[PDB]
Amino acid sequence: GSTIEAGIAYPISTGFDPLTSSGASSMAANLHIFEGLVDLHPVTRQPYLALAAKEPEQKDDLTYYISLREGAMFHDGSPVTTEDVVYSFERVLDPAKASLFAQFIPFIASVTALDDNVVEFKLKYPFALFKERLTIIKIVPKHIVEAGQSAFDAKPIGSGPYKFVSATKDDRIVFEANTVYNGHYPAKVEKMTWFLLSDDAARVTAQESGRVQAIESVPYLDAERLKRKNNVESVQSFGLLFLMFNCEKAPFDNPKVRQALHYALDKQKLIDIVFLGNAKAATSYLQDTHPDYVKASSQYDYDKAKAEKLLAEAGITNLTFQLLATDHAWVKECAPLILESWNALSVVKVTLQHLQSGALYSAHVDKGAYEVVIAPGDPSVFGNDLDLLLSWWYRGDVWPKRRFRWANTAEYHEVQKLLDEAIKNPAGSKVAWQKAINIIAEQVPLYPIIHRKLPTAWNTKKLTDFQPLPTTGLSFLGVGRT
């Protein structure tokens, strides 16, 4: 009766419905609970067949036929049917359903079932990464989702190698093995419990006491001490801290003001004291180790005087605003340093307010009831291609229109044209993406302050084949006990 126990670092901030499950711990749970037709490996990010019975057969440039894995089953016993696959795509694509993820499949024109086994995928244009993106659209049980979406959001039913048992905020997420799963990554333990330990001291203690076998997001100050008994490995990651403005609210609609507040921040002090060197001031949308990294034409290295000159040019004589920030432990350590830099400026006064992530977005950001936010973000949980990473924040309406309120600008429209150019025209995508990034880096509606490295601690003697993620989350796919 072997079990796994893990210490997770992000509180539950969304439900588990893949239509909208953007919170880290939710996404990390759904890698185990759901399957795309093809999935990405949480460590290697390589694609593998999941619900797809074999490699998608491409009839022509716009048309793909995909077949279902014989005997596929949802956790409630029903079979995975081709109607479920179609419902899964149509509901993400349906604007009335309010998904957070349709801007990850803009190339998809139709998803039609041809019979009990086969689904035709019709594309609006040739798109090379069609297999790669299927991991974003998890296949969901229509007949359960239609009896009540919010009940499914709280008790997710999937076809993955683990079934959901229960989830209790501040406590734990619980899974059990799915014994009819017939994919590539069957569950190697019976019971899996994820303790929700967002407090750094508590997370460390759990691991250092031996009460859990691995923990996410090792606190930087505790990293070396924990190597005494445990493997600790720090991975370079797209994971970042962004600065987000409400671009409908004066004076933050003036890019001139948004730039000054980046210049005012002393990133080096931040990297030394909070991250003990394990992060890097942003020099572009990507981190400098990302394969498509191309240095941006705007850089924002600590320059107070430029920040002053820019505010004077904007006509800011006495700005007061509240900074909203999430509750994560390392975001709490960054907030004073940030505020100290802004409050150093002659014309700016800044107060601070922390909120749980879930409440920050649903009660403040989603409603425009803010001015300035810092929060962590890691869209590479969805994959690593540049268009994916840009699209998260800059395609469509999910962030630019519903959240940072910049879709009204000409720069926004020009970023749309550039993003669409680059996925239609692979030959010219590099050039198009550099123009889009330079526009983003000059306008800074939402833009990274730093990218950081992720430490994961685990016990090599107790687990088998565990590897740390280059993103948020833990993965126990193919991971055994001992």
Ligand SMILES: O=C(CO)N[C@H]1[C@H]([C@H](O)[C@H](O)CO)O[C@](O)(C(=O)O)C[C@@H]1O
């Ligand atoms: O970047 C992504 C991609 O799903 N999601 C981020 C997620 C996302 O920004 C929120 O759910 C709002 O969409 O926020 C957090 O869960 C958090 O602030 O606690 C971090 C998480 O990485």
